[PDB]
Amino acid sequence: PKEMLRAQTNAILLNVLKQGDNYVYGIIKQVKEASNGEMELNEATLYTIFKRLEKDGIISSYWGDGRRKYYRLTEIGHENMRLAFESWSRVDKIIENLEANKKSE
Amino acid sequence: EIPKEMLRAQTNAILLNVLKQGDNYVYGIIKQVKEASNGEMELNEATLYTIFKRLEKDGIISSYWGRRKYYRLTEIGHENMRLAFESWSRVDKIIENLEANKKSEAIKS
């Protein structure tokens, strides 16, 4: 499901930035390496995603050094990742509790 | 805040699990979720109907008729839960490897 691929890619890209400011080609290599070559991101895909995240204030950019454009997770972005991770833990709990409670009937 | 696209996902995630554990009707679903959430999540009836209309359209669930309307997980539905779970395992692995590789990046330098 397209809805899901998008989410997972975003998930990953934010984790990369959560590990350090980086530029598009560095991000691509890092992901290709952490995925054992299973996820080879196109440049244009990253620009698409980052344009949305920059508009929503979840990331921002700036010039580094060979002059590269760097991307960073904002404070809001670290906050969304935190809210997200928490909300999903509760969800996994509630699922366990559904099972538990169902069996006790 | 939590993007609306994500609250929807979480709710769907939960609802499919309920159905994965047995065909059920809206009131039973609501009750079950309220109980398994220690009251923290009360789904509104009309919200369930809206979600189930989408899932029925996508054939993820189907329904049948005491007098309660029941909802069941289809085989497509069982399959998407499996694909979902697997896709997300790989994703967690990728993220574990990002951490790992970052730490050994940091050792060397």
Residue numbers in the entry:
A (entry chain A): 5 to 69, 74 to 113
B (entry chain B): 3 to 67, 74 to 117
What does the paper say about this structure?
We present a new class of ArMs featuring a genetically encoded noble‐metal‐binding site based on a non‐canonical thiophenol‐based amino acid, 4‐mercaptophenylalanine (pSHF), incorporated in the transcriptional regulator LmrR through stop codon suppression. Next, we investigated the incorporation of pSHF into Lactococcal multidrug resistance regulator (LmrR), which has been demonstrated to be a highly versatile protein scaffold for artificial enzyme design. We selected position V15 for incorporation, since this places pSHF inside the hydrophobic pocket at the dimer interface. Here, we report a new class of artificial metalloenzymes featuring a genetically encoded thiophenol for binding noble metals and the application of this design approach by the creation of an artificial gold enzyme that shows efficient catalysis of abiological hydroamination reactions.
Optimisation of the expression temperature, as well as the addition of the reductant tris(2‐carboxyethyl)phosphine (TCEP) during protein production and purification, minimised modifications of the thiol group. LmrR_V15pSHF is envisioned to have two specific metal‐binding sites per dimer. To our delight, LmrR_V15pSHF binds a variety of noble metals, albeit with varying degrees of efficiency and sometimes accompanied by oxidation. In most cases, there was substantially more of the metal adduct detectable for LmrR_V15pSHF compared to LmrR_WT and LmrR_V15C, showing the potency of pSHF in binding noble‐metal ions or complexes.
